[PDB]
Design a protein around this ligand. Sequence first.
Ligand code: NAG
Length: 497
Amino acid sequence: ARPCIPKSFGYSSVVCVCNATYCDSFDPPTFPALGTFSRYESTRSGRRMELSMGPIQANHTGTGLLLTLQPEQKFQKVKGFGGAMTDAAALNILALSPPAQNLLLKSYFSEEGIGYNIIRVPMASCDFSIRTYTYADTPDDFQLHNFSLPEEDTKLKIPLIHRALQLAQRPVSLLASPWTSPTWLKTNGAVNGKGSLKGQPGDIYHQTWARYFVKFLDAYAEHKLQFWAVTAENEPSAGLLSGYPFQCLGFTPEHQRDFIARDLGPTLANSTHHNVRLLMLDDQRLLLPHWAKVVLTDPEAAKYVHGIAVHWYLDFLAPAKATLGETHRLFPNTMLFASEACVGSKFWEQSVRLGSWDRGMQYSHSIITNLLYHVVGWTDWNLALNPEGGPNWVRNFVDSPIIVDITKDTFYKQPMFYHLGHFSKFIPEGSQRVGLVASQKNDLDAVALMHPDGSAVVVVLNRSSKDVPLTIKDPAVGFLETISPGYSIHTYLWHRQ
Ligand SMILES: *[C@H]1O[C@H](CO)[C@@H](O)[C@H](O)[C@H]1NC(C)=O
């Protein structure tokens, strides 16, 4: 194990420096006997996922807040955690020396890292690319004979994905999402701007688009990479806003409904990739529960939809109860998955804030809220960016857990990285969220889950400045006496047998 090498850039906290020959890492996991718990702590004051151990006694010496585990109250099962392998992220990673590259990849997917098991893959270009393009830019090739993968996939994205799964501690699932389709298939013949597919669901246009997903999946299959799921379109509501800058393809909720039912679903279901999951929406949760009602209430469409994917930033504000909550109630069997979660856009804030503890807290808090509202998985945006928040052919407006400084063969791990880690590293796929009852009103954000092996995992986030005394109870083991320091994030682990 190697500790974090702190560096400050004038913000609330520090970043962990990593170069070609050094990067903070964890030792293989070793779970303690019954009556003992493990604590991983990170604090704005510097500490980064530091490990410590303590006892779980049958005696309760705490007189403050009490969180009781209710393993019997069971909810959703976790799919996993990850990030997007965009053109930008791959260019930044591939800009470091090979040795540095592996330390970065291990940071994310290795047991020595935080164990990512999900990777979102853009289908062709998006705003985080250094050039506009699709897999079939040659006009009027409805049978997609010239469909092919550019250097971005074959030289950048794909090789990095392979290297990721190799280092991968756990099985990694791949999620694919399109931004725009060839311009000749669109009403406005542009990669961006207000424009949807031409004609209506069912014609040669929509059929050509549907085929495109299959062509993508084949091309990747040819490269020994199979996907777990695909989104019907990235942020489809954006393609309805006149003059949208990023590559898009607008779909009204009705249009997505007819498209899934008429073209995408049938075409996918009739291909050798029929086992690939189809996720709808993949947009801001403010569009729920409406978008859900329009699509899922149509059997011809619903039968093809495995789950609803949501985005929603952090700098802004949204009500989870009215959005994720209501949607689960109306459709309890359609999983909710977070396909994109970024932050750092406030018009007054710098795009990339090296060491910002606030942005980290926004991730852990947002992940906790999602978990409390049935979400089964999390997919961060760009896996890595430069200090300017790029490259982005349109404009930099978001941060990233890892920032690469190309000119010094070094990369920085932001508070964001560890906050994500507090979850992704200790919540393997298959884990199931369970009850965690607070004895009284408090200022902490907590969530409990049960590993597939039965052990317990509890994350406690303290966004306040004051230290909060806390007692955690597992009816089967006893009481865990601890303290949640102001501006900290904890993750407890313990055997229940
Ligand atoms: C960065 O890695 C360690 C950590 O600070 C440092 O000692 C080393 O000199 C740096 N790498 C190089 C070769 O500059």
